[PDB]
Amino acid sequence: TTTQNVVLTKYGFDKDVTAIDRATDQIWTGDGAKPLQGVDFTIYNVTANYWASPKDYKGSFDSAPVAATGTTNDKGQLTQALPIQSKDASGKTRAAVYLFHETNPRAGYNTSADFWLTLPAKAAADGNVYVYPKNVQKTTYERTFVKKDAETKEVLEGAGFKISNSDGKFLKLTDKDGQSVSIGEGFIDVLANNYRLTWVAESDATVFTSDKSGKFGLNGFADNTTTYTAVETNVPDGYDAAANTDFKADNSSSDILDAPSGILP
């Protein structure tokens, strides 16, 4: 009838740093790493799969009941009480086995490998069981643009843009769950906000808007080889639209000029 608290902590390290494994009885603060928030896990009860044939068990959670779901908090943690005993396929009580399956990694990180364990596990001094799945940071790319008045060369606020790809689809940012978000002016930190880049019809696209510094753009691009196009869709009054701007997510910044509209006598 008793349970054990499993505490899962998700730490991100620098791209060239591979953290050493920590046992379940070690409370580890992650020295040198950032706790990763918003990472989704499903915990499967694989007791029946495992006990069907222990020596053959290799992490299948096919037909396994969901024991729990969770999402890491600001400390990169989720905690779940799990029954230490559970039934096998025939209804016989066994030591429980649980499989942790990451379903939604944080933007900018690779997904971690499935892992499983039998309960009761060796617990720390506080009675909790600590697990630390490894999340390898991936390289992502960004792009910055600066809107300027072509005549004065001064930065220009409030020009709205959409971004399209070679398929003629347009960029829409969503939250980690695919839901719409309200995107403001300036450079959008997809990585810090755990957003997602999606490609949709033009009318559903996200509008990026130059801020007080003329800046807009975003990070979180998957590569630096794909060509996109920035298309000015909201031109400040008194200006002519810029020509479309082809670009790659190459971490650069570049200017986009708006020519003042001419007025003839």
Residue numbers in the entry: 38 to 302
What does the paper say about this structure?
Crystals of full-length GG-SpaA protein belonging to the monoclinic C2 space group diffracted up to 1.9 Å resolution at a synchrotron source (BM14, ESRF). Crystals for full-length GG-SpaA contain three molecules in the asymmetric unit, where the head of one molecule faces the tail of another. Each GG-SpaA molecule is made up of two Ig-like domains connected by a short linker with an interface area of 641 Å2. The two domains are bent by a hinge angle31 (i.e., the angle between the principal ellipsoid axes of the domains) of 152°, in which the N- and C-terminal domains (N-domain and C-domain) consist of residues 39–175 and 176–302, respectively. The electron density map clearly shows continuous density for two intra-domain isopeptide bonds, one for each domain. Formation of the isopeptide bond (K-N) in the N-domain occurs between Lys47 at the end of β-strand A and Asn172 at the end β-strand G, which corresponds to the pilin motif found near the domain interface. On the other hand, isopeptide bond formation in the C-domain is between Lys184 from β-strand A and Asp295 from β-strand G, and involves a proximal catalytic Glu269 in a hydrophobic pocket made by Tyr276, Phe198, Ile293, Phe182, Phe245, Phe253, Ala196, and Leu193. Intriguingly, the three molecules present in the asymmetric unit of the GG-SpaA crystal are seen to generate what resembles a pilus-like fiber, and where the corresponding pilin molecules are in a “head-to-tail” arrangement that may reflect its native biological state. Along the axis of the pilus structure, each of the GG-SpaA molecules shows a rotation angle of ~120° and translation of ~78 Å. The inter-domain hinge angle (152°) in each GG-SpaA molecule and the head-to-tail positioning of adjoining molecules allow for the formation of an elongated spiral staircase-like arrangement that could then offer both flexibility and rigidity to SpaCBA pilus structure.
